[PDB]
Design a protein around this nucleic acid. Structure first.
Ligand SMILES: NC[C@@H]1O[C@H](O[C@H]2[C@@H](O)[C@H](O[C@@H]3[C@@H](O)[C@H](N)C[C@H](N)[C@H]3O[C@H]3O[C@H](CO)[C@@H](O)[C@H](O)[C@H]3N)O[C@@H]2CO)[C@H](N)[C@@H](O)[C@@H]1O
Ligand SMILES: NC[C@@H]1O[C@H](O[C@H]2[C@@H](O)[C@H](O[C@@H]3[C@@H](O)[C@H](N)C[C@H](N)[C@H]3O[C@H]3O[C@H](CO)[C@@H](O)[C@H](O)[C@H]3N)O[C@@H]2CO)[C@H](N)[C@@H](O)[C@@H]1O
Ligand SMILES: NC[C@@H]1O[C@H](O[C@H]2[C@@H](O)[C@H](O[C@@H]3[C@@H](O)[C@H](N)C[C@H](N)[C@H]3O[C@H]3O[C@H](CO)[C@@H](O)[C@H](O)[C@H]3N)O[C@@H]2CO)[C@H](N)[C@@H](O)[C@@H]1O
Ligand SMILES: [Mg+2]
Ligand SMILES: [Mg+2]
Ligand SMILES: [Mg+2]
Ligand SMILES: [Mg+2]
Ligand SMILES: [Mg+2]
Ligand SMILES: [Mg+2]
Ligand SMILES: [Mg+2]
Ligand SMILES: [Mg+2]
Ligand SMILES: [Mg+2]
Ligand SMILES: [Mg+2]
Ligand SMILES: [Mg+2]
Ligand SMILES: [Mg+2]
Ligand SMILES: [Mg+2]
Ligand SMILES: [Mg+2]
Ligand SMILES: [Mg+2]
Ligand SMILES: [Mg+2]
Ligand SMILES: [Mg+2]
Ligand SMILES: [Mg+2]
Ligand SMILES: [Mg+2]
Ligand SMILES: [Mg+2]
Ligand SMILES: [Mg+2]
Ligand SMILES: [Mg+2]
Ligand SMILES: [Mg+2]
Ligand SMILES: [Mg+2]
Ligand SMILES: [Mg+2]
Ligand SMILES: [Mg+2]
Ligand SMILES: [Mg+2]
Ligand SMILES: [Mg+2]
Ligand SMILES: [Mg+2]
Ligand SMILES: [Mg+2]
Ligand SMILES: [Mg+2]
Ligand SMILES: [Mg+2]
Ligand SMILES: [Mg+2]
Ligand SMILES: [Mg+2]
Ligand SMILES: [Mg+2]
Ligand SMILES: [Mg+2]
Ligand SMILES: [Mg+2]
Ligand SMILES: [Mg+2]
Lengths: 231, 56, 120, 248
RNA sequence: GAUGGGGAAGCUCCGUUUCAAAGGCCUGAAUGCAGGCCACCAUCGAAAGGGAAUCCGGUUAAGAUUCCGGAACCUGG
RNA sequence: GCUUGUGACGGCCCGUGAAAAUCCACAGGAAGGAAUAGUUUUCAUGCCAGGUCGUACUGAUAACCGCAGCAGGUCUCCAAG
RNA sequence: UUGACAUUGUGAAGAGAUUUACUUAUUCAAUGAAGCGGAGCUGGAAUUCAUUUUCCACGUUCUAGCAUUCAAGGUCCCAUUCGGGGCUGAUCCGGGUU
């Protein structure tokens, strides 16, 4: 107010040193940063074979977080949870109670790879959760072709580390349960039939179709404005 | 000699004017003038090119 | 979300740089003071020439540790013989031993303190 | 045999360029937002002589677009460029001696120097004293000019590549006879040690294929193949033809 | 001539700002957090190159622009 | 007049004739700033201290190299009638 | 030096009893990896199926000045003694540095 003036800078070629701007796209990034971004793009380009590209079909957080909520009440025995069941029942049953009958039968989410596979081979499990992010990817990709042939309904899910927190660890890869609770028989077969929708029965369609492509930004707007506009 | 200038009073190392050391006299005199003439002619050029902006 | 990168030049983020908690020392016991005052000034130089400098120049000529600089000398010359040291000039004799020319201030007599150390 | 003289040069050592008293490298301004879209102004602060180069250099200050500092550039003075003049640099820049422009941005017939072979390499062609390249035509497709180089061969480069308007100073320098051994001595004292040159036909057979003696003669064809091997290549190397031509 | 590095079976070779996350200042809140700028760059390489600053007189068998007497100056507090 | 330094200049080049440490200066205006006082340590004066290695002598028809106290070889300063 | 095989992926025509698609491997160049790629703002003519209808512009050129303090101005919050924060100033969208 008029002890002052309004003095706009010209901010244009030949004058007025440019203002600070967000160069976040232009930054020369550390090498390790470069690769992890560029390893994506490389896999985004090319052509993904079907059995690799059969992933990236994931569970929407709707079905996901509800499936997870079922699994989440089944958490396997934990650190202090094993102190009770052991030092009590291994005491109260020492010379006294019945062998293996002194503690209740458990229900848990049954984790580990050669664990989970052996089950799926022997038809002892119902719901399988195979995470999308596993390097190597060979640790998994055989299962969606195996889980179909063995008739066990399976779900490709987000969160290799998300399935882990369910099981007490940092990371999981496969997480699959077996028995459940007599009351929860509803939700499971509700999950099974709605999970058979995306990847169980629709899976044989996923195979025939491949993946890949994705010209990416600057090449996209080049091909669109070429063929689809004028050329 | 160069480092002897840190042993000497500032009324040596300069004289009283804009650019006391550095540029000399007629060059600081010519400095002032040439600034003023372009600053004026700036204003003139803004307006003469803002008037052929207006009436057309 | 995002972040405002004002510069495109990336730099290494700063990090705590914890101090050191050894858990077993290094040395058993610290070394006792090597080059103490009874080391520094080694021995008098009694030659007839340096002697003439005592009774005239008011200077005490001493062989000294080759490892002892002009400070250590002056500190150890004061401490041992209890005198004020004006100035100190050190050379290294041909044989590889340091000779110190230690001048006593006006408050003292170098010849007195000389044969107070018992050479004259 | 021995290792002939022309092999020993690739090892550096004696044969490296004498660089001490030179100015910096002579390079254009970096190709940036400024020159690519608009233009930019800078004063040529001084021209000046660069050792072992017969083509005076012009030192052009600029103001840093992205920070408050001065940025000095080393340009090859174009004959008529002068201390105090304002050099303008970019695609929007005018057509005047001393200005650097994209090549497609000039009409054909325009003559230019220090011209980039590919955009933003900060100049290659026609840097020597008294050299220029004439734009002989343009293209709608693929940002191509086409130009005739001082050697006379025409080369098609990118219309985004730059060049400075004019022909380098240093005039007719090679008209004046060297006149003296010493004048050629100081010529190369500031360049590189190729001088003087002992004739291979004057050496012993160990030192040079020519070096056969008992008379002074080369003894076998002085025209060597292209597929020839290092140590055999001396004389007329790929020579298409030989002898006095008189070809205008 | 080290260093990310890239060669070479290897002794080692190339490289000196390079296809690297390459830091170290001044301030307040006795010392960490909050300020904040600034950041292409180990080191070795001159007793004739660059360079902070001393002179005279006296003195020894043998040292002195070094000691002594007197008069100064420079850097750092 | 000799040596030598400096001032002002003239000529020579297809030769136009080091670098870095270091030092002062300018532009800028972030900032702190007075009245019974607060300001400045580029003005004067006053206080204290300055480590380490070298330092002798020859430097040549005898002190270096050339088997040697060798008519050889080995960079430089001062220069009376 | 020439051929082959392997690094070696994705496409299209048109030919025998060979021309040219695409970018992600690899190869070169520049930078203190600043302004790329698409869309939109405003100004003029395109003009009458009076609109989606495309083109064009969209910060610096008498001068050997000056150009730096997260920006002045404007527009919001805080109790603001004095400074202090958000957005504008400087369009948006992609993070493919060119
Ligand atoms: N190759 C050396 C080059 O020197 C250049 O530097 C140029 C100048 O900056 C430098 O000038 C120096 C100056 O630095 C120094 N502080 C003072 C000195 N009198 C000047 O010297 C120069 O100018 C004077 C006067 O015009 C002449 O008498 C002298 O011959 C000339 N060399 O001398 C060069 C010009 O002769 C650049 N630093 C660079 O291109 C490169 O290092
Ligand atoms: N003196 C100025 C001119 O010099 C040139 O004459 C010289 C050259 O033309 C001729 O060829 C010389 C060659 O001998 C010498 N060894 C090297 C020199 N580069 C050559 O020059 C030659 O090659 C250069 C590129 O290198 C070309 O640009 C040039 O057209 C060509 N004549 O050698 C002549 C001298 O011996 C002009 N042709 C002539 O008309 C005129 O005298
Ligand atoms: N240069 C201005 C004048 O210099 C005169 O003195 C100068 C001359 O005596 C002498 O200058 C010579 C000059 O005579 C002769 N005709 C040309 C020569 N280039 C100059 O030399 C000078 O410049 C060259 C660069 O070219 C520098 O490398 C050199 O160090 C410098 N002395 O060196 C002095 C310093 O430049 C006087 N001081 C006076 O007349 C005036 O100040
Ligand atoms: Mg298919
Ligand atoms: Mg003055
Ligand atoms: Mg000493
Ligand atoms: Mg002795
Ligand atoms: Mg040989
Ligand atoms: Mg060189
Ligand atoms: Mg020679
Ligand atoms: Mg010849
Ligand atoms: Mg010859
Ligand atoms: Mg012969
Ligand atoms: Mg031969
Ligand atoms: Mg012969
Ligand atoms: Mg012969
Ligand atoms: Mg003969
Ligand atoms: Mg002959
Ligand atoms: Mg002949
Ligand atoms: Mg032959
Ligand atoms: Mg090395
Ligand atoms: Mg590199
Ligand atoms: Mg700390
Ligand atoms: Mg020196
Ligand atoms: Mg003597
Ligand atoms: Mg004295
Ligand atoms: Mg006389
Ligand atoms: Mg020279
Ligand atoms: Mg000064
Ligand atoms: Mg000032
Ligand atoms: Mg001496
Ligand atoms: Mg001596
Ligand atoms: Mg002598
Ligand atoms: Mg002799
Ligand atoms: Mg001898
Ligand atoms: Mg003789
Ligand atoms: Mg002799
Ligand atoms: Mg001689
Ligand atoms: Mg081959
Ligand atoms: Mg082939
Ligand atoms: Mg092939």
């Amino acid at each position: 107010n008029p002890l002052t003036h309004s003095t706009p800078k010209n901010f244009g070629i030949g004058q007025a040193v440019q203002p600070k701007r967000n160069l976040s796209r232009y930054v020369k990034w550390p090498e390790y940063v470069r690769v992890q971004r560029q390893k994506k793009i490389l896999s985004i380009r090319l052509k993904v074979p079907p059995t690799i590209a059969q992933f990236q079909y994931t569970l929407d957080r709707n079905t996901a977080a509800e499936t997870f909520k079922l699994f989440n009440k089944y958490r396997p025995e934990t650190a202090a949870e094993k102190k009770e069941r052991l030092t009590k029942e291994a005491a109260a049953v020492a010379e006294g109670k019945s062998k293996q009958d002194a503690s209740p039968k458990p229900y848990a989410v049954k984790y580990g790879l050669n664990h989970v596979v052996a089950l799926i081979e022997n038809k002892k499990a119902k719901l399988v959760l195979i995470a999308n992010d596993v390097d190597p990817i060979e640790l998994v990709v055989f299962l969606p072709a195996l889980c179909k042939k063995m008739g066990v309904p399976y779900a490709i899910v987000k969160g290799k580390a998300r399935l882990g927190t369910l099981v007490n660890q940092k990371t999981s890869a496969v997480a699959a349960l077996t028995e459940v609770r007599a009351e929860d028989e509803a939700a499971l077969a509700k999950l099974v039939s709605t999970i058979d929708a995306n990847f169980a029965d629709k899976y044989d369609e996923v195979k025939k179709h491949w993946g890949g492509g994705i010209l990416g930004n600057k090449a996209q707007a080049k091909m669109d404005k070429r063929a689809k506009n004028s050329d | 000699r160069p480092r002897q200038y840190a042993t000497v009073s500032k009324t040596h190392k300069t004289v009283s004017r804009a650019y006391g050391g550095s540029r000399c006299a007629n060059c600081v005199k010519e400095r002032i003038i040439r600034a003023f003439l372009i600053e004026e002619q700036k204003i003139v050029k803004k307006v003469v090119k803002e008037q052929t902006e207006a009436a057309k | 979300a995002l972040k405002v990168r004002t510069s495109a030049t990336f730099r290494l983020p700063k990090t705590l740089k914890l101090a050191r908690a050894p858990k077993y020392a290094s040395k058993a016991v610290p070394h006792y003071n090597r080059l103490d005052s009874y080391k520094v000034i080694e021995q008098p130089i009694t030659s007839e020439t340096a002697m003439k400098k005592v009774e005239d120049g008011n200077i005490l000529v001493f062989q000294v540790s080759m490892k002892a600089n002009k400070y250590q000398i002056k500190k150890a010359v004061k401490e041992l013989y209890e005198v004020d040291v004006l100035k100190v000039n050190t050379l290294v004799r041909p044989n590889g031993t340091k000779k110190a020319y230690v001048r006593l201030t006006a408050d003292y007599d170098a010849l007195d303190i000389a044969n107070r150390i018992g050479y004259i | 045999g021995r290792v002939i003289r022309n092999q020993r040069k690739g090892a550096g050592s004696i044969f490296t360029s004498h660089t001490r008293l030179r100015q910096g490298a002579a390079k254009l301004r970096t190709l940036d937002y400024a020159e690519r879209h608009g233009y930019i102004r800078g004063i040529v602060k001084q021209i000046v002589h660069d050792s072992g180069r017969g083509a005076p250099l012009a030192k052009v200050v600029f103001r840093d677009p992205y920070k408050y500092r001065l940025r000095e550039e080393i340009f090859i003075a174009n004959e008529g460029v002068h201390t105090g003049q304002f050099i303008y640099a970019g695609k929007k820049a005018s057509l005047n001696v001393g200005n650097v422009l994209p090549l497609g941005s000039v009409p054909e017939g325009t003559i230019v120097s220090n011209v980039e072979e590919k955009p933003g390499d900060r100049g290659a062609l026609a840097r020597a004293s008294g050299n220029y390249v004439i734009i002989i035509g343009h293209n709608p497709d693929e940002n191509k000019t086409r130009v005739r180089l001082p050697s006379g061969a025409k080369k098609v480069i990118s219309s985004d590549a730059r060049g400075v308007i004019g022909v380098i100073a240093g005039g007719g320098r090679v008209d004046k006879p060297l006149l003296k051994a010493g004048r050629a001595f100081h010529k190369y004292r500031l360049k590189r040690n190729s001088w003087p040159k002992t004739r291979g036909v004057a050496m012993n057979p160990v030192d040079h294929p020519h070096g056969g003696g008992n008379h002074q003669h080369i003894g076998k064809a002085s025209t060597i193949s292209r597929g020839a091997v290092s140590g055999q290549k001396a004389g007329l190397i790929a020579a298409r033809r030989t002898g006095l031509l008189r070809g205008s």
